[PDB]
Design a binder for this molecule. Structure first.
Ligand SMILES: O=C(O)[C@@H]1C[C@@H](O)CN1
Ligand SMILES: O=C(O)[C@@H]1C[C@@H](O)CN1
Lengths: 532, 535
């Protein structure tokens, strides 16, 4: 398989016309999205709404929370379907995801793009690299990796033949996905299902519209009933219920560190009830850096940092939020950042394709980001250089904000904001090595980071010093935008278990291999010849 | 790339060089006690907590005197290992692999008799059980894991202009605690060695009852060039060791083989302390089984008998893979029962160093002897149980237990569910026409999922049983015994209560001990931050 092409959406292109039509189709619409258990559409009385981030008077979806009883019924029905699904040949399960990929690539591309734009506030290009390219690639590449894994077989020596069976996990997997990438939900539920597991998928409230579109495509591509249950739910209720089931065998999580730790501790408390040891996979965010050496190409520093810090409002686990600049380059980089900042358009991405990024996801995110801006107006070490405005009267709109910190270990240099907030620390050129150590030691995270430098010896030194500061490390490129099969994604420290979705080993977390030895001759006597 | 093959099993025939070498090594150990220190870096350290390892078949023979590391020494070993980790992790994978390939060659040749003899005298193994363990399996772990690790570096991502992508297989940041069991010398070498191969530093707590052979393996690794502070040799009280390593903010992994309750205890300790760790520790555990031999009416009776006798009673049944429940159809039970009882009477139990005619010897220690004796007494009191053969034991000289064959009328008797780790086989006879119902009982009776075998010559029965028993065994055998997996051929492990099933002996095990980093280097300027569609 090859990577899905990123379309250019030029004027008069087929994809731009198709997208504009899909956006027009959605403009005044609310979809009633039920829970799906097997083939049954289930409504509870716990009604919820997904709002359009840039126009929160527009309810894009009405959905409901599954209660404990519905979740337990979804577990029971999934468990009853698991054996038949696990016994299917790997190629037959892969075919579902390959057909779903082809649907997303072609006739459903505009739909999933438009639903990600209106429901999660993404611009055209951010929806294209997410709901199309990345999700399509997850499905195609994981299918390839899984079919290839069946060929990894042990040595056979006469008179015995050995065969490895890549079993699904026995039980069900709980998939808990975040708002910020439509593709991640598809992968968190889809990769375990591909490997023969059955899944309860709790999608993110703030991404329900696009998440359900993906779910329906999987069902239409041939996913049998009760292999993935579509079960929006209150977060704590969902976690309590699945960690209370004796049949839990895995959690595939992406979200906050505290939630992942909570789930981990619930599993540990309940170890005595489970039939097997559940497998927890988590990607938990980062406080990612762009580190600049005095030899860097300034124009690449500027555009790469503007994109990494502000695309999709900074709402990426991989977004740059700390920029380290040598004093000798600061007049250039400050001047260019501030001039380009004034050209950034924030607005409605469905109506204005000139928009660079739009509103942040919801009222909770808006309130959290505003608190950080108020902190930046209070702290003696912080100064807002540009931006700092926010307005939630129409959408949850936060202007891009550039802050300078005189303190390299200020809280704003350490804590994940998940908003369009970039903090810059200016270091003396002669304190370069000491500052590299600060990049490594300042935060608890280890997800992404970039070094900009045109000096080979400097790049080699920085690469060694930052070896554990980033699981996705970039030389002269921005810290966001990993591509399936090219940059498998994840990191350690507090950023998670680093199972590297997008690479060939991720699917191994969702299989429990069995080795069958068949002997084709009689065994003979139990004694040994040396005993005589 | 690396070309390796399994280590050949030697025959130990009369007059052979390996038989003469082993007899000399055994003679050299017979009257000896080795004083085994803790090793931190290159320093031999003694504490006041003196302990002894006894010869299981002659417990008046203290084969080793060692000591338990105290909490101060354990924390000093952590600090020193962490201070050595970055240099070791930055070594090329091929350079780390060379240590284990050299160690494997030493074990294969000049050190073979030493590690065999120490496993025999210290753990009670016969010649062949020591040979398949301390020689063949340990050598194979070192050679095959080295091959798998060198080849893993060639698993690289796609690059598209203008960028080049590379995966760096980093060791875990922190230290790994390796906690090994008494019953296989090879397992301790793998539990400590495989993480070290992948760039980790390790605190190795070996089993008290396997100390002599475990230290022999440790010395061989150091002689093969393992640098100081990469593996710390730290025998310790079990609870004290777990408390110390799970209290360190730098714990990144636990590689464990032993009991279910101990593994669960460590897992809960890590969860309790989650807020202090720099990263999320990785727990790997293999935790035993209650393994089955299932016989269909089409089975070859001779293979059933010899395969079950070996699986049930070799090394006294002290294997995580040993068969302890045998399911026999009523039609074959007369033939099988008579042959089992006849062959049972020919099984020699005795001193494995003095009598190479010994089939198996004493069990490992007084605690195992006491546990097995209580089960034998249960077999004499239960109305559903009857002892068909064996049943006696005697601990006056060694911890000697006869092989015992019990028939249960109840497929759910506690002796059909609980791991004894002794030479105790329980047989359940089922009506031929209930073989499907009985297969469901094989699958549902115990909490374990490690090994199992089906004996049948009917192809359809084999296929049917293979489907129904899919999750009853992670190592499944057709017309062969449930013990004796070979590295590279039957990667070993199972799920349910048997552990995390990381399959040591196969190509994926080492992936638990690496945390990959992907580096993207872009070779052209980035251009503008706007996109063309925005114009
Ligand atoms: O690198 C990035 O920004 C995206 C987010 C994750 O889905 C991984 N790829
Ligand atoms: O299958 C067996 O009996 C041994 C025990 C483990 O070391 C794996 N190989």
């Amino acid at each position: 398989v090859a990577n899905e092409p990123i379309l250019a959406f030029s004027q008069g292109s087929p994809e731009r016309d198709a997208l504009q039509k899909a956006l027009k189709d959605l403009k005044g619409q609310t979809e009633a999205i039920p829970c799906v258990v097997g083939d049954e559409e289930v409504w509870t009385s716990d009604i919820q709404y997904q709002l359009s981030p840039f126009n929160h008077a527009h309810k894009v979806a009405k959905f409901c929370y599954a209660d404990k009883a519905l979740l337990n019924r979804a577990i029971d029905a999934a468990l009853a379907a698991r054996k038949e699904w696990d016994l299917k040949p790997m190629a037959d399960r892969a075919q579902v995801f390959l057909k779903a990929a082809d649907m997303l690539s072609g006739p459903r591309r505009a739909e999933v793009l438009a639903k990600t734009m209106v429901g999660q506030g993404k611009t055209v290009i951010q929806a294209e690299i997410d709901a199309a390219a990345e999700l399509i690639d997850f499905f195609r590449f994981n299918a390839k990796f899984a079919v290839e894994l069946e060929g990894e077989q042990p040595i056979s020596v006469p008179p015995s033949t050995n065969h490895t069976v890549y079993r699904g996990l026995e039980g069900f997997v709980a998939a808990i996905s975040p708002f910020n990438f439509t593709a991640i939900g598809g992968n968190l539920a889809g990769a375990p299902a591909l490997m023969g597991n059955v899944v309860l998928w709790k999608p993110s409230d703030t991404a329900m519209l696009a998440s359900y579109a993906v779910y329906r495509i999987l069902r239409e591509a041939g996913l049998p009933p009760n292999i993935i249950q579509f079960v929006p739910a209150d977060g704590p209720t969902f976690g309590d219920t699945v960690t209370s089931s004796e049949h839990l065998c895995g959690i595939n999580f992406t979200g906050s560190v505290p939630t992942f730790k909570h789930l981990w501790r619930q599993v540990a408390q309940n170890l005595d009830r489970f039939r097997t040891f559940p497998r927890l996979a988590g990607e938990c965010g980062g406080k990612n850096f762009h580190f600049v050496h005095s030899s860097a190409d300034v124009d690449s520093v500027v555009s790469g940092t503007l994109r990494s810090a502000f695309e999709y409002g900074g709402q990426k686990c991989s977004a740059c939020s700390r920029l380290y600049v040598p004093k000798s380059l600061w007049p250039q980089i400050k001047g260019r950042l501030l001039e380009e900042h004034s050209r950034i358009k924030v607005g409605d991405p469905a109506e204005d394709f000139g928009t660079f990024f739009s509103a942040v996801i919801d009222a909770k995110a808006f309130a959290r980001i505003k608190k950080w801006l108020e902190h930046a107006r209070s702290s003696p070490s912080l100064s807002i250089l540009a931006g700092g405005q926010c307005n939630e009267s129409v959408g949850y709109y936060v202007e891009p904000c550039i802050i300078e910190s005189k303190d390299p270990q200020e809280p704003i240099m350490k804590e994940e904001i998940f908003g369009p907030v970039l903090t810059v620390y200016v270091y003396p050129d002669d304190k370069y090595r000491e500052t590299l150590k600060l990049v490594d030691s300042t935060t608890s995270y280890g997800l992404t980071g970039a070094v900009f430098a045109q000096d080979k010896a400097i790049v080699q030194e920085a690469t060694r010093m930052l070896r554990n500061a980033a699981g996705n490390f970039y030389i002269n490129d921005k810290s966001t935008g990993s591509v399936v099969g090219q940059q498998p994604f994840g990191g350690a420290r507090a950023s998670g278990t680093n199972d590297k979705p997008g690479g060939p080993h991720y699917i191994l977390r969702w299989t429990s291999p069995q080795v069958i030895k068949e002997t084709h001759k009689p065994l003979g006597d139990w004694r040994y010849s040396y005993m005589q």
